[PDB]
Amino acid sequence: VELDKYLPVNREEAFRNGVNKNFAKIEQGFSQRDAVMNSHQTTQKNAHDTEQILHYLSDKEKDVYYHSALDLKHYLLLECSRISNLVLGATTDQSVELKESRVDLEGKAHITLYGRLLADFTRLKNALDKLIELEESFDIPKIEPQFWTELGGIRNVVQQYFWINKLNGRVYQTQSDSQAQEGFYINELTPSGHFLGTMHIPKGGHGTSLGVEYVNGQMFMWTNVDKRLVKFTFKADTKLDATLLRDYMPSSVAPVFFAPVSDWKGEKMAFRRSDGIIELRDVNDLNKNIDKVYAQVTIPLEERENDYRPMQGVAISDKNCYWMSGWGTDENIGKVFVYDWHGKLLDTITLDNLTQVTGVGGEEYASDNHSEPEGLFFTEDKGKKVLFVGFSTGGTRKRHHKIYGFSQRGGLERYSSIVRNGAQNYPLTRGDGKAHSTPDGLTKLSDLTKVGSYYAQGSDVALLTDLPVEFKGVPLWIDNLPAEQHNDVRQVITRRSTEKSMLKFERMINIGKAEQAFSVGSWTVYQSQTTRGEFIDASIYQNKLSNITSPKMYMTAENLFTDHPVKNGNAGWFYENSGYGVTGEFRQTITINSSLRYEVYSRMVFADRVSEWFV
Amino acid sequence: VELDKYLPVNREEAFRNGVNKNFAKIEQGFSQRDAVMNSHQTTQKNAHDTEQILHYLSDKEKDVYYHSALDLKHYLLLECSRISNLVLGATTDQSVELKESRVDLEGKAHITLYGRLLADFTRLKNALDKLIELEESFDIPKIEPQFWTELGGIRNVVQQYFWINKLNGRVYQTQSDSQAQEGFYINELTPSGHFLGTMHIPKGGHGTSLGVEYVNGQMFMWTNVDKRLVKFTFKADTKLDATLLRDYMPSSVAPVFFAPVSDWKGEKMAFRRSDGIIELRDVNDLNKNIDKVYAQVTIPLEERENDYRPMQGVAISDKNCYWMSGWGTDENIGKVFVYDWHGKLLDTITLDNLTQVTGVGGEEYASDNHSEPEGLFFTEDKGKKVLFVGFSTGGTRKRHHKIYGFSQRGGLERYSSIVRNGAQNYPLTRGDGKAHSTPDGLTKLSDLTKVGSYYAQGSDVALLTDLPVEFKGVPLWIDNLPAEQHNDVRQVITRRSTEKSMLKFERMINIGKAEQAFSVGSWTVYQSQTTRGEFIDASIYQNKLSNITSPMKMYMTAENLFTDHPVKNGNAGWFYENSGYGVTGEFRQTITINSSLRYEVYSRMVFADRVSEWFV
Amino acid sequence: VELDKYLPVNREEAFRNGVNKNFAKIEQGFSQRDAVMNSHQTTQKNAHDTEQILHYLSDKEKDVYYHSALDLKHYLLLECSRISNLVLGATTDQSVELKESRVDLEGKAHITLYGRLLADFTRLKNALDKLIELEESFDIPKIEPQFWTELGGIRNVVQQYFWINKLNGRVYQTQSDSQAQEGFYINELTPSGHFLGTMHIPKGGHGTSLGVEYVNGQMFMWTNVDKRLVKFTFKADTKLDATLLRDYMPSSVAPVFFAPVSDWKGEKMAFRRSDGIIELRDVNDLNKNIDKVYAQVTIPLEERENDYRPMQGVAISDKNCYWMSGWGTDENIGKVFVYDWHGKLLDTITLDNLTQVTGVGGEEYASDNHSEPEGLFFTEDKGKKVLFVGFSTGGTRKRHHKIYGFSQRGGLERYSSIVRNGAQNYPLTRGDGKAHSTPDGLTKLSDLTKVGSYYAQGSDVALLTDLPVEFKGVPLWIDNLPAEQHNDVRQVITRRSTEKSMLKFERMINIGKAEQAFSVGSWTVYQSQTTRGEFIDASIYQNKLSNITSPKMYMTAENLFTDHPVKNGNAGWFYENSGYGVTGEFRQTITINSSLRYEVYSRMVFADRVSEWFV
C-alpha cells in the first residue's frame, strides 16, 4: 500500500484529488489483505515447514522453566531411528548389559538401576535449581538497601508521601500544610528530582497517601476532601473545590474516615480507615458505582498511635500488603512488615544498615543526629522488582529528604542512568575537596585556559612571567569562570595575604582555535582596604612617581617620599588616579589629612607631560 | 437577513497538516502488519503447536483406528503407544527392577524405559538451554537506551559524525564549516568528552562520514577530497592538500562522489555513493590495488533526499548494516533500520522512549525542542555488544550534544566508570540545588571550616559570638572557597538585605592539623553603595565617634545622631569616610557635606591615643 | 482584492465531517483485523489441516523413502504402513527392551546401554559446568580494572597503606612523617574518602603496614614500635607511647624488625620482616602468648631493595598471598605476583591499561607524566571477591591519590552506590564546561530563577526589558548563587566589555511560590576601574546631568559639556556621586583635575529641587 503523503496545501486541485486517490488505494489494500488471510487459513499449498511447529510431551501446565516441548522434525527423526534400530540390532547377553549400566558417573556400584538414575537426576536437578532460584527470587530479608537520589522541597515541613508516574517518569511529594485546617501540598519533580511546580489543596488532611488512576494517557488523583472522593488532574494553579465535581462515595464507609491508596500500575485501589482495616477494591467497579470487597487485614494498636509507634508508610502489590513502623529513632527502631491478603504476617526487618554521611549505620552516624522514615512505594517495571523507602534527614528547620531502594539483581541500572543524566560531569575541584595545581612550566597566564580552580606554588609563581608587578613573590590563586560558547573564558586572579591586601584582576581570553584569533582583554582592578597600608619600593618605579601606571590604590609612611620628584613633604600620602579619558590621560590626585600643612595635589599626567602641581 | 460568509484559505493549514500526519500513521500500520505476517509465514520459530492441527485419515489407516478426523497430538500419541506396545509381546515381563525403573520423576506410569528416559532428558535440556540463551540475546527492539555522556564543541553548528579509538579510548567528532566550499573540522576529545585539539580540512564536502585504518599501532583516516582518497594521520595542524598524498581510487567509482566508513576493528571498509548503494570492500585490497565487491545494499529514495527524510549517519558490522532516518520531530520520527548483506530488511525502531531533561519521552519534554538525531556507531569490545546513537539538542546557535547506547545485559559498567573518572565527587551544594545548613551548636566563626556553600538562619544568626557588629541582626550567608594544598580555605561573608545594601568580607584561615597551627588573617572589605546609606547608632559606638574601627564604610547619615557625638551643632548628618589606613592605627578620616548652605571638609589624623583637630 | 482565495463556510465544513468518519472507520478495521490475527496465533482450534505442511527429509530418512521433500500426510501414511509390517523377535529374556533403549537423543545407535548413558550425561554436564563456572570464576589475569574513587590527605607526602573498617565502612590511610627518625600519620575518612581527623605516631618507622583486630565491637591497631607490639585504639589525640601499655612481642622474633598486616576479617595476621620471609600467625594465639608458625613464603631479594625493584605494598588472603613490584614507570613496570602458601609462584600481571585523565592506559597520558604504585588490600564482603590497587599521581609537592579495583562479576554495585552518596547531583554546567544558554523567548529578567550559571547573547538583550541603562547593547552574563531554604536566589550581572568595564550588579529575588509574594531587591553596585573611563551620552539622559541616579560611575568627555546645566568649562569635567542619605537624596560632585583651571562643584540633588554649584 503506497499512499501519497506530502500533499500540497496551497494548490486547490492537487489536495482535493489526492484525498480520493489515497482512500481508493486504502480500500483496495484492505480487501487484498483479507483475501490473503482467508487463503492462508484454508488451502495455501506450502503454509508451514515442520521446524516451526512445537510438540508438547505430556500436558501438566506450561511452566516457564520446565518445558516438555520438542520440534516436530526432531521427533520424526527419533521415530525413524528407533524403528531402524529395532530392525538392525544384534541382541546379546542380558546379565552383561545389566551389570555395566549400574555404574554411575563417579564410579561407585549400585545394585539397582533405579538408584543410579535417581542419584544422577537429583544431582542435576539441584544444580539447575540453585541457578534458577538465584535468577528470579525476590527475598527481602537478604537484600542490602542502596542509595538512589534525593527530592527537592519548598519549605521546612517534612514530606509524607511520594509516588512515581509511569508515563512521564516524574515523581510527586506531599507536604503538610501549616494552616488551621490541615491541608497538603503537591509538587512536580523531574525524573532526577528537581522542582517545577505546586498545587495547594486546603482542608485535605495531613496527607498520608492518595489514589492514582490513569485515563487516556493522563493521571487523576483520588482524595477524600469534605466527604467527597473527587477525581481531578494536576495544574499549576491554586485550590480545588469539591462541590464542582461529583463524588463517587461508597455507601458502606461514608461516615468513617478513609484514605485511598493505589498500586504502581493504578488498577487496584485500597482504602485505609480509622479502625485500622485495609480493604482491596477495583477502580472500574468504583466507577460503575458498585461496592466490592476482596480481602482485608487488621493491624494492632501498638503500631497505630504516635505515642507507642507512629503510623508511617503503606504499600500495595498484587498479592501482598506492606506496612512500616514508627519513630525510627534509636527507640521504636523503624521496621517494615509484610502481610498476605489472608491475614498473615511473613517477615520483618529492622532499618539499621543504611548509608549516611559518615559511615553506614544508625542515626548516630549522620546529620544532626535526627533521622526518620516518611513513606513507602513499590513498583515493578520492565520485569524487575524494586521497593522504595523514604527518609527525612536533617534538623529542625533544616530538613532534607532521601530515598532508598531494595532490589532484585537487575536493579536500578536504569535508575543510575537517570541520576547520571542530571549530574555535574566536568570536574571543577578534585574529589578530595582540594584545588587543581598548575602543570610544570607555565610561562604566560594565557596558556592556562581550563574550566575550574587553580592554585599555584610560590616557587613557580616566580617562574611566571608576564604578570602584574604587585603580584610578585607571594603565592597566586587562579579561578577561571565557566565559559563562552566559543570556549572563551574569564580569568580571575587573587593574592594570598594574611596581612596586607587581596586584589582581583579580571580579563577575557579569546583562544581562537577555529576561526577567531588570539586576544587578551584589558585588566580590571577591584577596590578594597585592610588594616595595613601599601608600602612602596622606589627602585621598582624608577623614582619618577608618574611611572605609577597601575589603576586606584593607597600609600603610607614618611622617606620613600624623600626620593620623589614632587613636593618635598616629609610625610607620605596615597597615589590615586581618579579617571581616564581617551588618550591615556589619568587624573592623578594626592592628599594630606591633618592641618599641619593641609594640601591636596592634582594634575593631568599625560603620557608625555605633567601640568603644574597646585591646590 | 443573514448573508452568506466566506473565509480565506489560509485558515485551513492545521487541518491539512493533520490529514498528512494521519495518512503517515495509516501507512505505518500497514507496513508493520505486513512485516509481522511475512515473519510469521517463514522464519518464526514457535508458530503453532500440535493441538491446533487436524488430520484426515485415508483408507488404510481407517482399518486401524476406524475414525476419520483426529488432531495431530492424539494421532502421534497413538502411534507411539502402538510402537511401544509391540515390543512387550516379544519379552517375558517377569523382571521387577525394570518395572520399578519405568516410573519418571513426577510419578508417571510409562510403557517402556524409552518414555521415561526421553521425557526426563528433554525436561532438563529445555531449562538448561533457556538459561544459556538468556545471556546471548541481542535484539534491538527489546533494549531500552541509557544516557552516557556529553560531547564538546568549538562552534555553534551541529556535529555530524563520531567514533571511538580502540587504542586510547578517545573520541573524534566532525563539524561542518560555514565556508562557501564545504569543509569540515576534526576534533580530538578526552575519554569523557572534553576538548583537546583541532584540524581544518577545507573543501572536503559536507563530512557526513569517514573511514578508519590502523598502521603499526597508529590511526589513519581516508577521505575523498578533490578526487583523492588520501591516507593520513592526525595532528594539531591546519590545511591538508591532495598534492602531497598518493591516491588509491579504483576506476569503477572514480567519477562518482562518495565517502567511506569502517568497522570498529577497521579491517573492512565500505563505500556509500550518491546512487544510494552501499558496498563492501577490504582495506588490504585497496592498499595493494585490488578491487573486490562482496555484497551490496540499495536503499529507497524517500530516506535519501532532504525533501522526504534526510540522511544522518551509518554504521556497519560483520553481518548487519545499520541505516538511520530523518528529522526526528513529532513528525518524521527518527528511526533506525537494521539490514542484512543479502538485501533484506529486518526490524525498525522508533526513537521516542529516550530520557530527556524535563521528562521521559520525545520532544515535548526535551528542551527548546529540536532534538535532531545525528549519528551512529557500532562497536563490540571485550565480549560485550553495544550500539551508540547521537543527538543534537537546543535551538539556533544554542546547541548541545548527548550520547545514548543500547547494550547487552552487562556491557556498560566500563563506560559508566570511565565517565565517573572525570566527574565531580565533592558536594559543593546539595542535590536539589539548596545550600548546606549550619550544624547545630555553632558559636565560633572559625569552626565552620568545610568546603561548600552555607546559609545561616536569622534566629540563631546572632547566637554566634564572633561577628562584626555591622553584620549583626539579619540573616547571613557563608561561601567557603575550595581549598589549599594544606587544607587551608578562604572564607567569605555576605549579608542578606533587601533594601539597604550587601557587604563582603574575606580573610585567610589556617586549620593547623599536622604541623602548622591555628591562624586567622585580617579582614578585607570592598565598597558598595545604594539608594539608602547605613544608619549610625549613638548607643552602639559608645558615642566616641572615634570608636569606628571598620574600614571604608561610607557609613553615614542622619541629622540628632550628630548632637550626641563630639562634633558640635552640625544640624545635618555628615558622612564618615576613611581615605587610607596609614599603617599601625593611623587613619585618614574625612567627614563632609553635600552642597553648600555652608560647604566644608573636616579632616584629621586619628592617632592611637589622641587626635589633632579639624580644619577646612 | 488581488490576493486571497475564498471558500464558502457551509460547504467546507462538510468536507471535514466527511474525512473524520472515514478515519474512524479505518481505525475500526485495524482493530478487527488485529483481533482475528491474535486469536488465530494462539487459541484457534483448527488452524490448518495436515495437507498444507511441508517436511524436509534428513540424511537417514532419504535411505528409507528415497525422496527429499514430502507432505506431512504422505509421510504419515508411509510410517503407518511400515509400522504394521514390523515383526520383531521372540527371545524369552527382557533383552529386547534394552536393545530398544540404545537410541540416544541425536539418533545415533550405540552398542550397549552404557554408551548412551555416558554420552547424554556428558553432553548435558559440559554445558552445566560451563555456566556454573562462569559465575564464581575469579581469574585475576582476566579481570579488568575500574576506577572507584579518590582519597584525601594532609601534606605533600605520598600515602603508603590503606585499609577499610568492616563495621562503619570507613577508610584509613597512612602518610610517612618527614622527621629524622621516621614516623607515620593515620587519617580517618568518610565512607567515600573525605577527611575527618588525624593522629601522629612518632618514631614508628616508615608506616608501610599495620595490624587490625576487632574486640567487642571496637577497633584496635597493632604496630611494632621500640621492639614492642602494644594494642591501642583510635582517639582524637596525638603521640603514642609504648611505656604505659603491655606488649605482646613474641620471644622468637626479638632481634629482627617486623611489620604486621591483617586480613579483612582480622582473625589472622602475618609478619613481614626485614629478611623478607612472611609467617602466618593467629591473633587469638598472641592474645594468649603462644608462638605458632603455619606457613612461610620466600621472596626473591630482587624485589626487596631500592636499587633494582622497590617494594610497594602487600596483601594476604585465607588461601593465597599477593605481592607488587617497583617504580611502575616505563622502566620497572609495576607488576603483581601471586603466591600460594606451599610457596609457589603462579601468575604475572602488568599494569599498563589503567584509566588516566587523557588516556586508556600508559603514563604518557597521565598527570604531570608521573605516577607510581602505592598499595594493596584484598577483601571479600557479602560474598564478592574484590581486590583494590592504589595509585599516587603527580610530581614534586603536587601529589594526587587514586584507587583502582579488580572485582568479581557483579560486585561493585554497592561501592558505586557508596560513591554516588557523596557525589554531585545538581547540574551547574554542561559536561564540556559550557554555560547554560538563556531560554528562547525571554522577556523579563526576574523570570529566570534557576540555580547555575547563565550566558546570554546580545540578541536576547535586545528584547530583554528589565535591565538598567548602562548595560545596553552588550553581551551579558548571569550567575546565580545556590539557594535559600525557601528557594530564593541571588543574581549577579556582569557586562562583557573587553575594552571598558566589568560592571557588576546584585539583587535578591523572592519567588513566593507557596505563601510569600513575588518581590525584587535593589541593585547594589560594586566599584572598580580599568584603563578607560566610560563616555556619557547626552541624548540618553535627556540632557539633565542631575538626572543620573546610578551609584560611583566615573564619566568624562571634553563635547557633551554644553548640553548640561554646568556652563562654559570647555573641558570634560568628571562625575562621581558620593552618597545617598535616608530620604533618597544624593550628593553629586563634578570635578576638574587640572589646575590650569581647578575647581570642585558639589550640589545637593534632592528629589524635586537642586541647590547651587559651589566651590
**Residue-by-residue DSSP string for B572-588:** S-PPPEEEEEETTTEEE
What does the alpha-carbon distance between residue B477 and residue B503 come to, in Å, rounded to a whole number?
11
Strand partners, B403: B149, B390
Distance from CA of A293 to the nearest CA of C (A): 33
Cβ neighbours, 10 Å, residue C564? 17
Edge-to-edge strand order for the sheet containing B335-340?
A: B314-316, B320-324, B335-340, B345-350
The H or E element that residue C592 is part of is none
8 Å CB contact between C368 and C307: no
In this structure, are residues A271 and A258 in contact, taking their beta carbons and an 8 Å threshold?
yes
Q: Contact B97/A112, CB-based, under 8 Å? A: yes
Q: What is the dihedral of CA B201, B202, B203, B206, to 10 degrees?
A: 70
Residue in the block written with cell 594539531: B236
Tell me if C113 and A120 make a contact (CB, 8 A cut-off): no
Which chains border A (3 or more CB–CB pairs < 8 Å)?
Answer: B, C
Compute the Cα dihedral for C57, C58, C63, C68 and give only its sign: positive
Q: Please state, in angstroms and rounded to a whole number, the distance separating the CA atoms of residues B214 and B308.
A: 37
Residues from chain C contacting residue B7 (CB–CB below 8 Å)? 6-7, 9, 12
Nearest neighbour of B53 by CB, restricted to C48, C193, C551: C48
Alpha carbon distances (Å) from A39 to A1, A30, A355, C46: 19, 14, 65, 14
The answer to whether A495 and A503 have CB atoms below 8 angstroms apart is yes
Nearest to A483 among C100, C398, C434 (CB): C434
With beta carbons under 8 A apart, name residues in chain B contacting C92: 91-92
CA proximity to C349, closest of C372, C328, C370: C328
* Closest to C599 in 3D by CA, of C615, C578, C613: C615
How remote is the C-alpha of C139 from its chain's centroid? 26
DSSP state, residue C550? S
**In A, which residues are within 8 Å of B527 by CB distance?**
527-528
Subunits with 3+ C-beta pairs closer than 8 A to C? A, B
User: Helices C413-421 and A413-421: crossing angle, nearest 10°?
Assistant: 30
Phi-psi category of residue B345: left, alpha or beta, with phi > 0 → left and psi -120 to 50 → alpha: beta
**DSSP code of residue A203:** T
- Contact: C433, A439; criterion CB under 8 Å: no
Residue C488, all three cell numbers: 530564593
Enumerate the residues of chain C whose CB falls inside 8 A of the CB of residue A101: 112-114, 117
Contact present, C176 and C154 (Cβ < 8 Å) = no
Cβ separation B54–C53 shorter than 8 A:
no
Instruction: Determine how many CB atoms are found less than 10 A away from the CB of residue C615.
Output: 10
Q: Which residues of chain B lie closer than 8 angstroms to C200, CB-CB?
A: 514
Cα atoms found within 13 Å of the Cα of residue B111, Cβ hemisphere only: 15
Which one, of B352, B314, B347, B316, lies nearest residue B332 by Cα?
B352
Query: Do A455 and B485 lie within an 8 Å CB cutoff?
Result: yes
DSSP H/E element including B387: strand B384-395
Q: Which helix (H) or strand (E) holds A372?
A: strand A371-381
Q: Which amino acid is at B119?
A: A
Breaks, C-N > 2.5 A, in chain A lie after: 558
Cell (9 digits) for C129 = 559446568
DSSP A162-188: EEE-TTT--EEEEEE--SSS--EEEEE
Strand A504-510 and strand A489-495: the pairing is antiparallel
Sign of the C-alpha dihedral computed for residues B355, B358, B360 and B366 taken in this order: negative
User: What span, in angstroms and rounded, lies between the C-alpha atoms of A466 and A481?
Assistant: 21
Residues in chain A within 8 Å Cβ distance of C147 = none
Return the exposure string of A80-102: e unless at least 16 CB atoms fall within 10 Å of the residue's CB, then b. Answer: bbbbbbbeebeeeeeeebbeebb
Query: What is the rounded CA–CA span in Å between residue B615 and residue B604?
Result: 8
Structure-block grid coordinates of residue C320: 593465597
Burial of A251 (0-12, 13-18, 19+ CB in 10 A): exposed
Cβ neighbours for C1, distance < 8 A, ≥ 6 positions apart = none
Cβ C112–A105 below 8 Å, yes or no? no
Cα C567 to Cα B488: distance, rounded to the nearest angstrom: 57
If we measure between CA atoms, which residue out of B161, B146, B153 comes closest to residue B210?
B161
Q: Rounded to an integer, what distance in angstroms lies between the CA atom of residue A501 and that of residue A529? A: 7
Contact C552 B529 (CB under 8 A): yes
**Rounded to 5, what percent of chain A is helix, strand, coil?**
20, 30, 50
Instruction: Look at A419 and C425 and tell me if their CB atoms are within 8 Å.
Output: yes
- Cell numbers placing B285: 585490497
Alpha helix ranges (H) inside C393-500: 413-421, 458-463
| Residue B283 parent element (H or E) | helix B283-287
B274 vs B255, B258, B277, B340, C320, CA distance in Å? 11, 6, 8, 20, 63
Q: How far is it, in rounded angstroms, from Cα C471 to Cα B503?
A: 23
Query: Residue B438 in contact with residue B454, Cβ under 8 Å?
Result: yes
> Which sign does the torsion angle of CA C548, C553, C559, C562 carry?
positive
Q: Residue C203 in 3-state DSSP?
A: coil
C-alpha cell at A14: 492537487
**Residue of chain B whose Cα is closest to the Cα of A452:** B482
Closest chain C C-alpha to A280 CA, distance in angstroms:
32
d(CA B429, CA B424): 12
**Residue in C412, C502, C534 to test binding to A, most A beta-carbons within 10 Å:** C502
The answer for B230, left when phi > 0, alpha when psi is -120 to 50, beta otherwise, is left
Choose the closest CB to A77 out of C53, C58, C194: C58
DSSP B122: H
Resolution in A: 3.8
Determine what percent of chain C falls in helix, strand and coil, rounding each to the nearest 5.
Answer: 20, 30, 50
Distance CA B369, CA B144 (A): 22
Residues of B in contact with A421 (CB under 8 A): 147, 355, 357
Domains of chain B: 100-134 (no CATH), 140-421 (2.115.10), 425-528 (no CATH), 533-616 (no CATH)
Strand-pair category, A258-262 with A231-232 = unpaired
* Strand, helix or coil for residue A434: coil
Option in B126, B440, B522 nearest A498 (CB) = B522
Helix, strand and coil content of chain B, in percent to the nearest 5, comes to: 20, 30, 50
The answer to whether B398 contacts C26, with C-beta atoms less than 8 Å apart, is no
Q: How far apart are the first and last CA of chain A?
A: 98
- Nearest residue to A262 (alpha-carbon basis) of A280, A244, A277: A280
* Cα–Cα nearest to C403, from C181, C82, C149, C577: C149
The span from the CA of A188 to the CA of A196, in Å, is 5
CB contact under 8 A, A5 and B16: no
Quick one: which of A171, A185, A176 has its CA closest to A158?
A176
Q: Which SS3 state, helix, strand or coil, does residue B109 take?
A: strand
The shortest C-alpha distance from A576 to chain B (Å) reads 10
Strands (E) in C397-552, as ranges, are: 398-407, 436-437, 453-455, 476-479, 489-495, 504-510, 519-520, 524-526, 528-529, 534-535
Beta B146-149 vs B159-164: how paired, if at all? unpaired
Q: Tell me which residue has cell 534525593.
A: A150
Residue of C nearest to B595 (CA): C603
DSSP C471: G
Method: cryo-EM
Cα–Cα distance measured from residue C401 to residue C195, given in angstroms and rounded to the nearest whole number: 13
What lies within 8 Å, CB to CB, of A167 at 6+ separation is A214, A217, A219, B360, B361
The 3 state secondary structure assigned to B500-534 is CCCCEEEEEEECCCCCCCCEECCCEECCEECCCCC
HEC readout, C224-277: CECCECCEECCCCCCCCCCCCCCCCCCCCCCCCCEEEEECCCCCEEEEEECCCE
CA distance linking residue C537 with residue B323, whole number of Å = 60
Buried b (16+ CB within 10 A) or exposed e, B244-280: eeeeeebeebeeeebbbbbbbeeebbbbbeeeeebbb
3-class secondary structure for B221-267?
EECCCCCCCCEECCCCCECCCCCCCCCCCCCCCCCCCEEEEECCCCC
Cα gap A48→C557, rounded to integer Å: 95
**Nearest CB neighbour to A498, from listed B131, B200, B521:** B521
B569-593 in b/e burial notation, b at 16+ Cβ within 10 A?
ebeebbbbbbbbbbeeebbbbbbbb
d(CA B234, nearest CA chain C) in Å:
16
H-helix segments, B57-209: 59-65, 72-88, 96-100, 113-133
- Measure Cα distances from B384 to B379, C8, C162 in Å: 9, 65, 34
Q: Kindly determine whether residue C52 and residue A37, on different chains, have CB atoms separated by under 8 Å.
A: no
Query: What's the angle, vertex CA A50, arms to CA A44 and CA A55, rounded to 5?
Result: 120
CA-wise closest residue to C457 among C427, C496, C424, C499: C496
Contact present, C604 and B595 (Cβ < 8 Å): yes
